[PDB]
Design a protein around this ligand. Structure first.
Ligand SMILES: *[C@@H]1O[C@H](CO)[C@@H](O[C@@H]2O[C@H](CO)[C@@H](O[C@@H]3O[C@H](CO)[C@@H](O[C@@H]4O[C@H](CO)[C@@H](O[C@H]5O[C@H](CO)[C@@H](O[C@@H]6O[C@H](CO)[C@@H](O)[C@H](O)[C@@H]6O)[C@H](O)[C@@H]5O)[C@H](O)[C@@H]4O)[C@H](O)[C@@H]3O)[C@H](O)[C@H]2NC(C)=O)[C@H](O)[C@H]1NC(C)=O
Ligand SMILES: *[C@@H]1O[C@H](CO)[C@@H](O[C@@H]2O[C@H](CO)[C@@H](O[C@H]3O[C@H](CO[C@H]4O[C@H](CO)[C@@H](O)[C@H](O)[C@@H]4O)[C@@H](O[C@@H]4O[C@H](CO)[C@@H](O)[C@H](O)[C@@H]4O)[C@H](O)[C@@H]3O)[C@H](O)[C@H]2NC(C)=O)[C@H](O)[C@H]1NC(C)=O
Ligand SMILES: *[C@@H]1O[C@H](CO)[C@@H](O[C@@H]2O[C@H](CO)[C@@H](O)[C@H](O)[C@H]2NC(C)=O)[C@H](O)[C@H]1NC(C)=O
Ligand SMILES: OC[C@H]1O[C@@H](O[C@H]2[C@H](O)[C@@H](O)[C@@H](O)O[C@@H]2CO)[C@H](O)[C@@H](O)[C@H]1O
Ligand SMILES: [Fe+3]
Ligand SMILES: [Zn+2]
Ligand SMILES: [Zn+2]
Length: 341
């Protein structure tokens, strides 16, 4: 029983994984794939046990029988009394961010502008934004809405990958793993921060964590929060301090998924591992920390306080909520119950 195999997506996650595997005395081992979809396949086949996923992928995995096990949980003011592990999850805000200096750019004039997306099929980076654009546009030709973009996971020869940079050497352009410079919440923001794009589809937390010296990275050093603005759906523009009233949607937290015949086992090992390398672990700070990786969100988001039990032992639809499942369904009919593998 007692040994779990984690699936890392890309070289960087594999590096962090190997370290975790070592510090765990092999209670956790690693498997590597080039993409999130391939990691899902390895789990299906039973060659890997689990991995943490953005809601967009939880949906894909769910149609294939995988189940949400434990979810990421970040610090909250309200719901201060209960422990992190038993507290319900709040969800994150998906926002559209722009440069203040780009005066006059509103939600209603995004057509033909340049965009930065975390990656195709993800909640805040893709499903929410394109789901809304398809809807208001009446068209499915969402590949022709922005003049150019960087949407990791699309066809490299297409304009949707036009703005992506690849790795240190230009290799791997547009792959949906961290080797791509503008991949994920951080890459998408960098894409905008460096003015590669006009708008970026990330989450509220990303702006705060890479501005006002929160990120020591070279491209974020000098970034100032007041030089950014959120795009609201009412065609208005607000300070990043107002995400509560200028977001596109509230997304369900990323969560660890596994095959159901493995969940009980994955869950148990994870909570113990968490007591060891979690936020207040026996060994986190001194030897190793699961939720740390220098602004890179490798394996887990850097702002995870802990992985929380779920309660209501929800199926994937319940976890994602009727709201969002419906959003994804309506967008996917443009590309209807699957196991899309
Ligand atoms: C967008 O995304 C942003 C990034 O994730 C996010 O900002 C982050 O928010 C968190 C919290 O939401 C900030 O963390 C907090 O920072 C402070 C100082 O840096 C830390 O120190 C304290 O922590 C205490 C623990 O919660 C906290 O007490 C809380 O609980 C009490 C009692 O229940 C309650 O207090 C009330 O205060 C009154 C004061 O006079 C008092 O009279 C009244 O009776 C009552 O008791 C509050 O609920 C209170 O919050 C202290 O207040 C301090 O926070 C703490 O460790 C914590 O980490 C992050 O710093 C911030 N990140 C960054 C980089 O800015 C935004 O919130 C997101 N935006 C939206 C809208 O979602
Ligand atoms: C893009 O555009 C598409 C197409 O319009 C859009 O999909 C549409 O989204 C609507 C909203 O999600 C769907 O309507 C839903 O509303 C009814 C009511 O649901 C609820 O709210 C009440 C009141 O708050 C709650 O009490 C209740 O919990 C419901 O959740 C849904 O069904 C209701 O269910 C209750 C019981 O739970 C019944 O008593 C009622 O009779 C009623 O049936 C309904 O099933 C929908 O979920 C609308 O269906 C949907 N259109 C299509 C064709 O799918 C996308 O949301 C847009 N995407 C984006 C990204 O925005
Ligand atoms: C690997 O898993 C085993 C099982 O949890 C861990 O061994 C237990 O550790 C606790 C604390 O040391 C002991 O009280 C138990 O008696 C141990 N034996 C069991 C339950 O089989 C071990 O700590 C784990 N190793 C790491 C580094 O995570
Ligand atoms: O697929 C149904 C699940 O929805 C989850 O929550 C949604 C809810 O449906 C919607 O009405 C609103 O309340 O927002 C929630 C998302 O934050 C339920 O919590 C889950 O139990 C299912 O019923
Ligand atoms: Fe996400
Ligand atoms: Zn809202
Ligand atoms: Zn249920």
């Amino acid at each position: 029983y007692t040994r779990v195999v984690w699936c890392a997506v890309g070289p960087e996650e594999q590096k962090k994984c190997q370290q975790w595997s070592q510090q765990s005395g092999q209670n956790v081992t690693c498997a590597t794939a080039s993409t999130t979809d391939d990691c899902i396949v390895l789990v299906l086949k039973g060659e890997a046990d689990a991995l943490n996923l953005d809601g967009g992928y939880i949906y894909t995995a769910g149609k294939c029988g995988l189940v949400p096990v434990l979810a990421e949980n970040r610090k909250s003011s309200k719901h201060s009394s209960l422990d992190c592990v038993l507290r319900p999850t709040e969800g994150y805000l998906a926002v559209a961010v722009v440069k203040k200096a780009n005066e006059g750019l509103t939600w209603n004039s995004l057509k033909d502008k340049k965009s930065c997306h975390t990656a195709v099929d993800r909640t805040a980076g893709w499903n929410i934004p394109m789901g809304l654009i398809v809807n208001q546009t009446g068209s499915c030709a969402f590949d022709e809405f922005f003049s150019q973009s960087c949407a990791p996971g699309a066809d490299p020869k297409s304009r949707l990958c036009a703005l992506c940079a690849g790795d240190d050497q230009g290799l791997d352009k547009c792959v949906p793993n961290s080797k791509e410079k503008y991949y994920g919440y951080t890459g998408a923001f960098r894409c905008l921060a460096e003015d590669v794009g006009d708008v970026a589809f990330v989450k509220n937390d990303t702006v705060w964590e890479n501005t006002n010296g929160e990120s020591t990275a070279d491209w974020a050093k000098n970034l100032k929060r007041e030089d950014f603005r959120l795009l609201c759906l009412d065609g208005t523009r607000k300070p990043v301090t107002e995400a509560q009233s200028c977001h596109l949607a509230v997304a369900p937290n990323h969560a660890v998924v596994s095959r159901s015949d493995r969940a009980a086992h994955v869950e148990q090992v994870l909570l113990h591992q968490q007591a060891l390398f979690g936020k207040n672990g026996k060994n986190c700070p001194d030897k190793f920390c699961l939720f740390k990786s220098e602004t890179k969100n490798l394996l887990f988001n850097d702002n995870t306080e802990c992985l929380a039990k779920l309660g209501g032992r929800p199926t994937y639809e319940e976890y994602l909520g009727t709201e969002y499942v419906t959003a994804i369904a309506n967008l996917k009919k443009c590309s209807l119950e699957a196991c899309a593998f």
